[PDB]
């Protein structure tokens, strides 16, 4: 069961990365890829389950943040605009 889930997860991740690079590329400060942004969000969601909010820096392309917000993937902090969290789809 474990190895099956691992194969699925790795396949899903590789295909998701290829889809992101093919459909959400950077235009050309130092911006990070949407893949790295999603990785940071997913990592903070499970490393700090009591505070999954990450601060929005200048390396976050505002179109990427608005894209994640419109599609229900990212959620804004109720009071702090500089922080966004990942929607806990596992619960």
């Amino acid at each position: 069961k474990m190895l099956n889930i691992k194969e699925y997860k790795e396949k899903l991740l590789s295909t998701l990365g290829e889809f992101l690079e093919d459909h959400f590329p950077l235009p050309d400060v130092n911006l990070i890829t949407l893949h790295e942004m999603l990785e940071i969000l997913i990592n903070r969601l499970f490393d700090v389950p009591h505070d999954p909010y990450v601060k929005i820096s200048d390396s976050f392309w505002p179109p990427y943040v608005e894209l994640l917000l419109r599609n229900g993937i990212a959620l804004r902090h109720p009071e702090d605009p500089t922080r966004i969290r990942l929607e806990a789809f596992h619960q």
Partner: protein
């Protein structure tokens, strides 16, 4: 602690991929790989 959290992470990745495919408005049936991967979603990881 690995298996349960990996199940949760895989569920999160499923949902994120599905929402991104929906937001991109891509005719995913035209792309064969994208089509066969879209049908891979909606699989209960805890099975």
């Amino acid at each position: 602690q690995n298996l349960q959290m990996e199940i949760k992470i895989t569920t999160v990745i499923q949902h994120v991929f599905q929402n991104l495919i929906l937001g991109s408005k891509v005719n995913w049936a035209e792309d064969p790989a994208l089509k066969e991967i879209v049908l891979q979603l909606e699989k209960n990881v805890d099975m």
